[PDB]
Design an enzyme around this catalytic site. Structure first.
Site, PDB file in Angstrom:
ATOM      1  NE  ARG A 147     -45.744  -9.385 -76.922  1.00  0.00           N
ATOM      2  CZ  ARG A 147     -45.465 -10.529 -76.287  1.00  0.00           C
ATOM      3  NH1 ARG A 147     -45.915 -10.760 -75.055  1.00  0.00           N
ATOM      4  NH2 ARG A 147     -44.742 -11.462 -76.901  1.00  0.00           N
TER       5      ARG A 147
ATOM      6  CG  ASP B  17     -49.077 -11.005 -77.729  1.00  0.00           C
ATOM      7  OD1 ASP B  17     -48.051 -11.233 -78.402  1.00  0.00           O
ATOM      8  OD2 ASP B  17     -50.023 -10.344 -78.194  1.00  0.00           O
TER       9      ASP B  17
ATOM     10  NE  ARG C 183     -46.170  -4.477 -78.985  1.00  0.00           N
ATOM     11  CZ  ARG C 183     -46.104  -5.772 -79.315  1.00  0.00           C
ATOM     12  NH1 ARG C 183     -47.222  -6.484 -79.489  1.00  0.00           N
ATOM     13  NH2 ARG C 183     -44.924  -6.362 -79.476  1.00  0.00           N
TER      14      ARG C 183
ATOM     15  CG  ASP D 261     -42.909 -15.464 -76.651  1.00  0.00           C
ATOM     16  OD1 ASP D 261     -43.138 -14.251 -76.888  1.00  0.00           O
ATOM     17  OD2 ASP D 261     -41.762 -15.935 -76.541  1.00  0.00           O
ATOM     18  CB  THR D 262     -50.013 -15.923 -76.589  1.00  0.00           C
ATOM     19  OG1 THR D 262     -50.025 -14.724 -77.374  1.00  0.00           O
ATOM     20  CG2 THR D 262     -49.970 -15.535 -75.127  1.00  0.00           C
TER      21      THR D 262
END
Length: 130
Positions: A29, A15, A76, A34-35
């Site tokens: 990001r 991600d 990020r 959502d990994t």
């Protein structure tokens, strides 16, 4: 929304990627995904490799900020990343290597597109949906 050129510096996780954006290094990001995390959850290394491979093999990387907040609390950048015109965020979800995350501060332009990709990956029982 509009796409801007970027240059890959380094893939960090499924991600997160480090990119040279408008002259300077920056950690991005990926929006709405959502990994599994490697920093080691199941499919974490698979998601990481996928993101790494997709960005490293592309001739052109583009970043697209959404209309909401552009950076998170850790500094990020929050964006959709495109590798040769193909959205990395969508590919991860479609391949079943990430779940669609809750909308964050108004960044929802591609949420439906991703929700559809996810429904399909779920139906095919791909990876995370195994």
């Amino acid at each position: 929304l509009h796409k801007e050129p970027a240059t890959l510096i380094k893939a960090i996780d499924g991600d997160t990627v480090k990119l040279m954006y408008k002259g300077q290094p920056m950690t991005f990001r990926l929006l709405l995904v959502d990994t599994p995390e490697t920093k080691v959850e199941k499919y974490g290394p698979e998601a990481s490799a996928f993101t790494k491979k997709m960005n490293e093999n592309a001739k052109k990387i583009e970043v697209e900020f959404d209309k909401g907040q552009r950076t998170d609390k850790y500094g990020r950048g929050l964006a959709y990343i495109y590798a040769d015109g193909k959205m990395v965020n969508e590919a991860l979800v479609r391949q079943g290597l990430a779940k669609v995350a809750y909308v964050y501060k108004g960044n929802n332009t591609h949420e439906q597109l991703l929700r559809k990709a996810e429904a399909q990956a779920k139906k095919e029982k791909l990876n995370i949906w195994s």
